[model samples]
Each structure stands twice: as structure tokens, then as C-alpha cells.
Target chain A: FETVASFDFRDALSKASTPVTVVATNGPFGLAGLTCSAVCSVCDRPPTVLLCINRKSYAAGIIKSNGVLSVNWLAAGQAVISQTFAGVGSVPMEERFADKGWQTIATGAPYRMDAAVSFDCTIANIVDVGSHSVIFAEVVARNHAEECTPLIYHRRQYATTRSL
Target chain B: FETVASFDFRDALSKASTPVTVVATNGPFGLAGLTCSAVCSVCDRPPTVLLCINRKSYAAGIIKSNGVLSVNWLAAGQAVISQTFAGVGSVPMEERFADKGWQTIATGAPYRMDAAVSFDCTIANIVDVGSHSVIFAEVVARNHAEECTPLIYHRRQYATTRSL
Candidate 1:
């Protein structure tokens, strides 16, 4: 049987939500950050994290050359930041980082002073997929905050985390 | 340089949650299934999903030899199914599958009648990192369900999807 399924794939995934992270890379590739939910912890054993980005993303190729990237966990009150990086209204790359919450640490990678934490990592391991790269990195530095609420993405809309 | 930027890692991850999936494999390595929250969409161009499994889990090695596996999205009111697979109270593998919601539709990997969908996949690539392996696979098949209400894990407890 052919594997063609008749479901709206995007809508299926929309039933669940995950945290928003602004993945940033710097160095030879210059500075680039984009909102992503495809980032997650691979193994905290050595503080490892992962980032998945479609090659079509403007920030994708830059990450490989940068040698270091940061994954900033965008907390509540950060939807506008997420929108700006999402290229809302033609927001340019530089201007996205110009947000008031932006900051820098050891990696010199972009982060947010208001994020729960910016996992500063070294671009050390990777696996290529059909149109994306599974970037695995080691978290070497971090800037964390006592943030409570988290910005969420579910049902194709921006949402807030609820504790219950 | 010390790593003492203290925070309960798991607790931090709880601020946001994703759909819970029960990943299963059946092949030369023996049948194995367990609850997983580390699954994520990699890309749509070729349609891929990634699974992160700790090396210590009994299901980790079995998947490599299984050739294929299924990622079953757990829905609302399925906490007991999840708890069973999590080996709570040392529930035997067979007994976990004995739960009322279990079902299958091709691939013979494993899934539940209660899942929102089962991403039947072919294990294609992997990245070995500290204490875990990031398993990337191609969605060779799909089993959609009329199911709703995703069972989520947050703040150290299994949570229900809070629609926004």
C-alpha cells in the first residue's frame, strides 16, 4: 500500500505545544537568531542539547560556520520577539536581535536577559536529514532567570503556559 | 568555570510540554515499548521525526535492530497506559501491552487505539551523544485518529493539554 495519508499533517501536530527557543549562532557565520521549537535536550549527561533547522531557513547554513550557537528559552511576554524572528512584516535579521531583551555571554551568541536560560553550546556534532540538519551540541555556558510563565505554540497560535 | 548555575533541569523543562508518545520496536532485538516525550518534528520536506532515548533504557538498543518503530501520540485519559509503559511498579512488558487501549495497523511495531496518530517510521539515522542517542526516522506510514486531548508531562506530573 502506498503511504499517502489523508490528514492535515500540520493540524495533527498543532494539538500539542512546546516551548519556543530562539536559536542563535555567531562567529564566522555572523550573528543570526530565529524562533524555533524543534530544539530540545538530547542528554543532560554532559549537558547536551539539539537543534533541528530546515536548510531553507536563513539561519541554517550560518550555524555550521559559526562553530558556536546558543539556544535561548523564550519565556512569557516573548511572543513579539518570536514574531520578529519569524520575519513578521519583513523584520530583518539584525533588527530581530535589536529587541530590548537581547544580551550576550561567553559564546558571544545572542540570548535574552529575560529567558529562562540561554544554553550556550559548541557546534560539535551533527546529522543531516532530508531537508534539515539535526544539530547536537554541548552546553558550555548558560544565563538563567527565575522565569515562571512560558510562551507556547499550539493550534497555530501563541499561548501561555498554565500550571495545574 | 564552574557548572553551578543551579536549577532543577526537569523542573525547568516542565514550563512547556509536548505530546507524549509511546515508542515501540519489534525485531531481532526483542519487542520493546516505552513512554517518550523527547520526540520532535525534524522537517516536512522528507517528513521526519526524532526520538531521544537514554542509553540506559531497555528500549534503546532494541530499536537499532528493529529496523522500524512507531511513535504513538498518547491522548487524554491515557495516563495509566503511560504509567504502565514507564515501568511503574515494575509492570512487565507484556502486561503493559495488555492495557485496554493498545492496537496496531500495519508495521506491526506497536501503537494504541487511543493515540491521536501513530507515526509509523523506518529508523534511518542516529547521533550518539552523552548517555542518549538521538534517533531520526522517516515516516513510512501514518495512522490518524479522531482522538483529542493530548496527555502532557509537566512540572513532574502527567498533564492534560490546555487549549488556548
Candidate 2:
């Protein structure tokens, strides 16, 4: 006989710390913007990436519609931006972008001013599980910022680096 | 013509604050103790929950082999213990139990002394891609400790709650 693992969503959310900023293409299936907790570099040769988006999220719908998404890794001072996209602060998705601080480099996806690196990609594969879409994207272009500290999330809170 | 994204795993590891502890199972498998980064609910009706895992890890192998794996979410004080099993200190796979402080509960797999929660599970399904594995496990048994604060990883380091 075998047993099963158990977890609570709130408690699990409290343990994660990667602050990922996600942007998808604009179209009939476009979502305003959203935040993701699960993102990782999947390949080294061509530098592919993977992101897991909940099936119910507006962003997931957009990615399915456009088949392209861009991920921006934020530097420090961008936690508020990430949280905004995360559906926090009670901001409606449409009204989330009250400022024009974001700009587009390529892929026509908007990126913030202080992001350390950006990954513009086209969806290479999509795996639909129970309620999430596991997306594998082939990188299209990358942008880097010279001087910036990455914004971080852990224990469900914002964190930054401190010199020792 | 299209370009692709580039990521520096070493740099990301250096800048990360979250301590992601993974049990490097046989051969290149990393059976990690991770929290679901997004919303997952268990409806008593169907009794289901979802979580994601990187497919490259050896833990993925066990999940594919035995069709089951366990996830142990450690308490804050168990950081060292979790790291031991994760092989972060370069402990040999067979010699992972060199740390006298580490132990396991039910499953012969190593576990921490103080984890907030533990779940033994059977793989309901697996979604695979570029480098990671997304796993959905049906919860079979669960244990919890109300007093234990979770060990968290963000920016690649271990963190606990702060007194504000």
C-alpha cells in the first residue's frame, strides 16, 4: 500500500521566493499581465525556458491564443510591479498599468524599466494538465541590464540583496 | 529571423535567496521538496491537487519508475537537514545519510526532523518538456505541525520569517 503527499495552497505560496514577471502577446486571447511563481531555464544549448501557468488565469488564455509569451526577470525595486500583475492590491487587470513606465524591445511584449534580463519567446509546446498549462518556449531574444539587483520573493514576501 | 533567450544558471543561483533542497536520487534525478507555487485546492468531492516539478531531476525517474514519490516541506529549523538530503553540500548519493541529525519517518526516503507538512503520494499524471517535469500527485496521507515555520528559498538562499 502507498500513501499520498499533502499541501495547502496558502502555506505552499508562503514558501516560494522567485519573483517572476510574465507578459504575453496582445490579441483576442491576450491577458493584461500576470505574475508566475514557477519559471525555470529548461535548456542550455539553445537556451529554452519553461513556465507553468494556471489554466484559469487570463494570461494562460492569452498564451494559448497567441502561442507566444515573454518573460522579464525583474531587478530590485520591481516587487510592486510583480505584485500588481499577481492580482494583488485589488487592481483590475485593465487598470493595472496606470503608468507608461514599461517599454517594448522585441516580440512586441512590454518590459519594465529595471528588469535585469528579458526573455522573448514563441511557445514551442504546451502541456495541459488538470488546471495548468505547462509551456515550453523557444527563446527568441534576450535583453540585459548593466547595473541592477534582482527582486526576490520568499515566504510570500519581497526581498532584496544586502552586502555583507 | 528569430532570436532566443539566454540565461546564466550560475548567476541565477548566485543571486537567488531561496534554498531549494532537492534529494538527488539515483543517477541524475533530483527528488526535491518543493511547494506548489500557485493556487491548488482539494475538493473533497474529487479530492485532487496539482503541483509541478522539474523533469530533469532523478526524482522524476522514481516518479516514472514507481509511479509515486513523496514531498516533504521542511520547517525553518530543518534547513540544514533538508540541505543534507538535497546533496547541496556535494554529499555522495549513497552516503547522503552521513549527517547524524537527519532521519526519515515512514517511507525509507530521508526526511527532516521538523517539517511543517509532509505528503506521500502517487503520481496522478506527469507533464514533460524541455528540462523539467510537472507532476500532479493525489494526496494519500498528510501530517502537519502548527508551530513550525517553513524553510523558504528565494534568490537561492534560505530564509525565515522576520519579526516586524
Candidate 3:
């Protein structure tokens, strides 16, 4: 009835393709940013969004200390942008922020200038649950680009999906 | 520096183009479901996902008592399944679960078959904020299908964009 016998679910998760975003954090975290798909909105009265960062990611702690973060939604043409921050293409540490199209809106965190939408926030609460910390952040400000398509990562692939 | 006074940020979020999904829950709140665009991964150590249900939505309460849920990832051509549950098309309560292709693998909760993937979960933690509550559910079991595309909600419309 169950195959808990040990199968990496990441294989099944690949089909659950989601939009791609880069989480940017500044300050004591020394401006750590990474590509993450594990994020979602929690509430709106305070405009909260929930972000799950693996504890191993060095940026996770800095994100906590900074107490503020930015959720940048990449446009369709920005897979390269996502890869640069994802550290896959390894754009290099000094040159990571040099890829261009970034702007500081409210939290002083940088977001891509061409992002479909940027949710600027301050951490509200944090919950620890198995290898990750769920950070609830309140959306204090938002900025968005006009008339641009967003990008999604699916099946271990980037930018390879379609709209309904 | 901020235009907090008047803004329709939804215009920007629409451009974010998220993977479309239908959140279905059954419990004291009575079998209820809705089309949700706000959902994402929290962690996989225990296979978890965070689903946001507007506190005001009828399904929110039902989901609370249900304590279990099925996060169905709609493959392409399942927007009708999404709409039926979304309450926009006024799908009958019985009909919402009628649209063919359903299976129960764990938690006794039903999920759509042919979904890109499905995560059957048990509510582990509930955090309430603003108009929605962040539901942290542990995916106790899972199932998936092969060779099918997914549907995305982009730019306030459905099925209108293509992969880059």
C-alpha cells in the first residue's frame, strides 16, 4: 500500500513545476541570494509570504539576521539571471551582482529591475521544521515591471512549461 | 520612496505566472475545495508543502477540521477541474469531485489523477495571518503520472503562454 521503502520524492516533485524566484538578502548575511522555488504567500493583512530555506544554505542564517528579504519573480527571459544567482552557472562571487537589472525598492534588498513582481518584506516569524526554516515575512512594499512574462522551473528543467 | 496609498499589485503578481493547483479538503467544514494559486514547497525532509487558504474562503474552515488534504497538481487540460473547485464556474458540490481520474493512496483524501503530481498530506502546523492561514502539511504519501504537460495561470488568463 505504501512504498516508504525509500524513494527520493524529488523525482515526483519535478512534475509539480512552479514559478522561479530569487531570494535576495542583504546586511549581515553579506548579501546572500539564491534561487528558490519553495515559497508562497501566507496572509495579506500584513501581506505575508512563507519562505522555506534549507538550513545548509549559508544565506538562511543571514536572512534571519537581516530580518528582511526580497522575493524577486524572474521574467521569462531571465533563466540566465536565475542561474547566476542559483550559483549553477557560477557567475562568480564578485561578479554575481554585476549581471545587471537590479534595483532597491524598500527593504534595501536588491531585486531584478525586470522582475515580473518584487515583494519586499521584513521577517515576521520563523518556524523550524526538518532541515529547513519556514520564515514568514510581511510584505511591506511591492514593485513590478509592466508587460513581461514570468519564468517557471519544472522537471529539473528551467523555462520549459506553458500557461493553462 | 513608496506608493503605499494606491496600488493594484495584483497586476504584477499575475505576471508572476504560477503553477495552477486545486486544494481540496474534507472535514467538518464540509467537503470543500477551491482554486488556489498561492501554494509552494516548505520542505521535503518529511515531504511538506505550504498551502494558503484565505481565512474568508468557505474551504478554510473545512480544511482546518479535515486535518488532511490533497495538493493536486493539475496537468494541462485540467483547468476545468480547477475552475470547478475554484467556485467561479459554480460547479456543484458533488460535481467538483466528479470530473474523472481520482485516486486515494494515503490519508483517504482524494486527488486528481493525471496531475503532473500529487502530494497527499496531513496538516501539521497551522499559522493564521491576515486573510489566510499558512498550512504546513507533511506529505505522508504520493503518486504521479507520465507524459503530460501542466497548466499555468499567467497574466490574469489561462493557457495563453508558452515555454521559453
lDDT of every predicted structure (CA atoms) = 0.72, 0.54, 0.74
lDDT score at residue A58, model 1, on the 0-100 scale: 79
TM-score of chain A of 1: 0.91
Which 10 consecutive residues of model 3 chain A have the lowest summed lDDT?
A: A1-10
Give the TM-score comparing model 1 with the true structure, all chains together.
0.88
lDDT of 3 by residue, B37-69 (tens): 888876667767888888888778888888988
Model 2, A39-69: lDDT tens digits are 6655544456667677787667767677766
Top TM-score prediction, candidate number: 3
Error of 3 at A84 (Å): 1.7
DockQ values, each candidate: 0.40, 0.22, 0.52
Off by over 4 Å in 3: A1-6, A92-94, A160-164, B1-7, B27-29
* Candidate 1 residue spans exceeding 4 A from truth: A1-11, B1-16
Which of candidates 1 and 3 reaches a greater lDDT?
Answer: 3
Q: In lDDT terms, how accurate is model 1?
A: 0.72
Ordered by lDDT, highest first, the candidates read 3, 1, 2
Summarize candidate 2's per-residue lDDT along B1-164 as a digit string, tens digits. Answer: 26442345334324423323333112123333333222232222223444545555444565456555445556666666556655467655556544543354444344433456554455576655445555555545444545655465544556654422
Q: Candidate 2: global Cα-lDDT?
A: 0.54
Error of 1 at A149 (Å): 2.7
For model 3, how does the per-residue alpha-carbon lDDT over A34-134 read when each residue is reduced to its tens digit?
88888776554555677788878767777889888898888778888788778886665446676567767788777676788888878888889878888
